[PDB]
What does this fold into?
Amino acid sequence: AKGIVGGGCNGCGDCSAVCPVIKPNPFEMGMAPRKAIYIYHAQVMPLIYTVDFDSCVKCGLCVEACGDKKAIDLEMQDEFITVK
Amino acid sequence: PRIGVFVCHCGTNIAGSMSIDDVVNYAKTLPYVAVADQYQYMCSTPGQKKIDDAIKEYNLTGVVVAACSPRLHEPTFRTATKEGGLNPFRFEMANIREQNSWVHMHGMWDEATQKAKDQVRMAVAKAAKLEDLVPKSVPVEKTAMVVGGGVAGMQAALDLASAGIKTYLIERTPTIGGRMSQLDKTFPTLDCSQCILTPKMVDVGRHPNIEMMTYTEVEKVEGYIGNFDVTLRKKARGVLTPTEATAKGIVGGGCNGCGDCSAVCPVIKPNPFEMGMAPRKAIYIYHAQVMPLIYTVDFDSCVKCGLCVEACGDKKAIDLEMQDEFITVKVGTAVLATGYELFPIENKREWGYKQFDNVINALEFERLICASGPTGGHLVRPSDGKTPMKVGFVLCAGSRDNTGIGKPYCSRFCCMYSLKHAHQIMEKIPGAVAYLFYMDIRSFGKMYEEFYYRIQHEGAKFIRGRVANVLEDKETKNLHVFTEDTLLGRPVDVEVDLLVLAAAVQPNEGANELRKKFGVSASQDGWMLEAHPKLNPCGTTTAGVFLAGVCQGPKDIPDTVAQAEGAASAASIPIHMGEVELEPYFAMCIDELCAGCGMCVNLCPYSALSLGEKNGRTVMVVTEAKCKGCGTCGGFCPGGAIKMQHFTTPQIVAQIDAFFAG
Amino acid sequence: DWKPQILAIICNWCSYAGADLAGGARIQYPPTVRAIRVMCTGRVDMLFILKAFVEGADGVLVSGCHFGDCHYLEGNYKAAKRMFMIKNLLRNIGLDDRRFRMTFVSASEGAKWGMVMEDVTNTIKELGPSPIKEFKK
Amino acid sequence: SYCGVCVIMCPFSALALKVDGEERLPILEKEGFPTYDKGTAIDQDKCVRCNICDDVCPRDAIDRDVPLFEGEDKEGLA
Ligand SMILES: Cc1cc2nc3c(=O)[nH]c(=O)nc-3n(C[C@H](O)[C@H](O)[C@H](O)COP(=O)(O)OP(=O)(O)OC[C@H]3O[C@@H](n4cnc5c(N)ncnc54)[C@H](O)[C@@H]3O)c2cc1C
Ligand code: SF4
Ligand code: SF4
Ligand code: SF4
Ligand code: SF4
Ligand code: SF4
Ligand code: SF4
Ligand code: SF4
Ligand code: SF4
Ligand code: SF4
Ligand code: SF4
Ligand code: FES
It folds into this structure.
């Protein structure tokens, strides 16, 4: 929709392979590390790799790892929708 | 044919038991295999994308996935095969996880690898011979049937009717309501149990979309998800409703529930609603709040004296010569809500249930304490009619019992209803004390623990000890209850005026007959079995049949109603769509191989086979809707004139041949 | 040099479920039996068993639902009669009839499935290689 | 967030990041951040083992690997 033909997120994992931030995983009740860009577990239904903006340092390594897929938009903001 | 083999690791669940690389190379060298490849999670979106890309690139005819069980992931990979330009049924799995890895984990690796290679070879051999099937879609009749007129049946019927589906409500007894109509007050809210039901009974009786058929049974059921041809037995009620009277020609009406008939009837018999404590004439209603107020005649006990018809007079509602009428009804889905009965506790001889007068069970206590019961709501001793001042409650009576007499399970609500009865006696008889001989108070539901706290606060005595035996005092008829107070650490001998047994519950009478008519299986416990114990507690394995209420297992009225509405929703799913797809496993007769012997016809439990005329030759005809895909006929036919659609003889024999290939 | 070749033909609704439950519960057993998975055991034709034995199955196992617990009301009675007759044929052609058996395994008997696997393996190991493989030549 | 930007951008290295038990900077390992070009060097074909550079150094960052002669110690060679 935004115009990137090559696609969005396919869940490859390169972004979290290169992210340098490490934070606790709330799915694992904090026992396990997860990067700033992450999925809870490998069986999440939308396999889309959220970015944790409270902990991201905007280093930009994730976008270079994502490459032509261009799925990462580090400047995204809270959008509001009204549904009847 | 061109087959692709995709081997999942399941995230080391399989790669930690075999050599996935070796399995993949063997698949590559197998005959007919175009591409062999592996992935960590083939059930995930990248895995389906891998399958689809392989299909498009290599022009794959079929797909073999060496992964978990088919019972776990046929729908997933069939949909993945469809999305990609193939038929869903050009797909076959090789179970190499739950039948190779998890069972050959330890100390045996090349053996598990060889087993995996064998399973992959057999799967490829079958898939190289699979061909295209299209599932059969069958229309769904827009009616529904609910067997059982208790709270669960009434809730399911009201839910379906308000969703707009015409519904039949079958009840064996002359009135709807069930056990909750017998309850006096309800835990933990202490609401008048009968009163809450009365509006809903009125709603059921007035709903235009509900065909309330009381005093009627289900003789036979044939059909499937599409059309169930259900035959009902309309037992001879003996009395005509106003509608039926007008139909038969009596303008003045039928039964208005005046009561003159039972005022003049001379026969007197026990009332099953009051658990036998109260008299009722041969022509009768259970209680004054029955929904069809139509006054059944009990023909096993009527003497045909004819006084009732003279009392009825010009209304002419009584037909003493009525017979069992039979009706056949076509329905789309069916909901089973048969409820429960109390386990026969006279078998436990140490608690003198039938042999001591002042030992009763919890439904008899509930009728004795109700204000509409045989007494004026006054609990009195059966032995002499005096008011008790000490009442004992034997909890777990016949339950959590592995001796073969009682039930090995918990009946769920007996701790809660015993607390309710203790409260009721302590508030209705001033100065009376309740003793509960308990072994794990189970107040688990919403507000249940608070109810337990409140009962203890009002002053019920809780003695943690299972009752050992009960002795009756010869003169006062008082009951000596012997057990040990396990927390106190001493034996006890509590002498009570009335002993109440919180007996276990069991499936109702005839419930096994009805669930065999509908094709439902039973649990270990003896209750009706559900499709999946966790994620599908309403549906059964036979399509189009759903469970609701205590018939699936004991439960309180809240849980029963939730289950009933869940079942109504599940039964509405196919009716609203109007289509439903059957699994294309049917038998297909190859006519120019059939010899017309007719011997296969009797091997079908569903009567899907018959002999018919095609091109002068008498050959066999399959009603593809009635076939279920078992394969008995096709495993019988000596000439090979019956083809099983996804499990054909060439396919199975190719699997055998591939197993023995070396 | 010799490993038994045992072939199992298990129904989908109780024996496949039981084998799956054994796997889920992590019940170990030797890796000698390979299964086919038909819908009911009523599907099992006699010619399947005989074809297996003539290709060289050292043993054949057919596993299905208990009597009265067939998913398709009565499809395992037909299989039971067929396998009784197969036992008679193998005895009279002179092959050892204990190379074949039919077990009734419910959906919840993963432990019993493991025990069946162990016992079938042991019996075939005692019996030895099938004679058809050398009688053919 | 344990990025380690502070460790890369501190002029006098008084901050270190240790991930498991080792000084490890993932952001440099992936080349996601530039580092300071202090650009130090001492052309050993011009230095004369003088002692001024170690003496005037405000922090402790010059190593003079020269045998210590009779000045202040026993002869390095003589
Ligand atoms: C003494 C006692 C006290 C209780 N107190 C409480 C309480 O305070 N609060 C609470 O929440 N729960 C209480 N319960 C539990 C409560 O009774 C059940 O949760 C509830 O009645 C379940 O209703 P049901 O519709 O599933 O079954 P039922 O009420 O038994 O209804 C089944 C109906 O189906 C009919 N039927 C049976 N077989 C057939 C057939 N083959 N064809 C046609 N119709 C058939 C029966 O005649 C009956 O009308 C108590 C139970 C007992 C025994
Ligand atoms: S965001 Fe980009 S790099 Fe990360 S998983 Fe998705 S597609 Fe791959
Ligand atoms: S921009 Fe954020 S998510 Fe991406 S690599 Fe840097 S810290 Fe990680
Ligand atoms: S398809 Fe089965 S074996 Fe493969 S990852 Fe999914 S659950 Fe595991
Ligand atoms: S006398 Fe007739 S109308 Fe009145 S209750 Fe009896 S049957 Fe019904
Ligand atoms: S015929 Fe006689 S016995 Fe029968 S219901 Fe009428 S009055 Fe009673
Ligand atoms: S609910 Fe309570 S009284 Fe009833 S069987 Fe279970 S533990 Fe015993
Ligand atoms: S299909 Fe086979 S068994 Fe059936 S009538 Fe034809 S020849 Fe006979
Ligand atoms: S497979 Fe044959 S025996 Fe089984 S239901 Fe279908 S037609 Fe009847
Ligand atoms: S710059 Fe230093 S203190 Fe700040 S977030 Fe990064 S590592 Fe932590
Ligand atoms: S100041 Fe340091 S670098 Fe310069 S000549 Fe002296 S010792 Fe060598
Ligand atoms: S369903 Fe297993 S034997 Fe019939």
The pocket of iron/sulfur cluster (ligand 5) is lined by residues B 239, 255-261, 295, 311-312, 315, 317-318 (CB under 6 Å). Chain B touches chain C through 47 residues (CB under 8 Å). Chain B has 17 helices and 34 strands. The radius of gyration of chain B is 32 Å.
